Amino acid sequence: AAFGRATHAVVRALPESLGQHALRSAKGEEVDVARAERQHQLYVGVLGSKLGLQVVELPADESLPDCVFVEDVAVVCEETALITRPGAPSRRKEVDMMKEALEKLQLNIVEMKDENATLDGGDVLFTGREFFVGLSKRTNQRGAEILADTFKDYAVSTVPVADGLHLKSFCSMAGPNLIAIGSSESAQKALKIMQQMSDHRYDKLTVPDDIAANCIYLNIPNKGHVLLHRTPEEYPESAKVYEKLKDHMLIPVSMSELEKVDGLLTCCSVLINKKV
DSSP states (O other): OOTTBOSEEEEEOOOTTHHHHSOOSSOOOOOOHHHHHHHHHHHHHIIIIISOOEEEEEOOOSSOTTTTOGGGSEEEETTEEEEOOOSSGGGGGGHHHHHHHHHHTTOEEEEOOOTTOOOOGGGEEEOSSEEEEEESSSOOHHHHHHHHHHOTTSEEEEEEOOTTOOGGGSEEEEETTEEEEEOSHHHHHHHHHHHHHSSSOOEEEEESSSGGGOOEEEEETTTEEEEEEOOTTTOHHHHHHHTTOSSEEEEEOOOTTGGGGTOOSGGGOEEEOOOO
């Protein structure tokens, strides 16, 4: 029915191999794995206990150190699940535990098994109206075409993404017809490419920190517009921009330890709307 409706959330536990062996763009501090596990169980508890989603929590795999970032292996729109082929070849066995979880929930399963196609679902921004697929180092044109043949009801457009990023490294849906966007020059150029290719005017929400533009919008029954954004302790200037949304229910979620391995808020869940 409404945009942002979900009943189910597919998540995955963190391996202890994440702190040394999961992929990171930038060079920085060592990853506290136990602090990354406590921040991820607060996130699952927002979706499961505080919002009432039905949580499938997949077990961790120590040979897959990026198995927590489950948005990259599955794109779900309505009841059709596109099982993606990820751009990193070491992450391609994370589609095995996802495919069992989404056919236990009885969705329609389309597998991206073409050997020339890559797509990360963190390059996929679903606006409710249409799809924007970021062309990056993890997602080619052939993976964007397989996403277009899977979802034939929706317009699929391509945007170039600057290097080492996903498309949702600087943007997400913060509500119906509302795109949160970072204020860097790679983020602002990509929003201008996305606004000229669409039929619709989207309302725009500029936050100063680019990683803080990744937020989770949810339409939850008997609670309304729900926005999961980053904390004021992490990013103070971008959380006061989120506090101007007085119709939204704002939940601050800390994700400070998974940000060292470029993992953001949308990357750790696949949100499913299952109907009757």
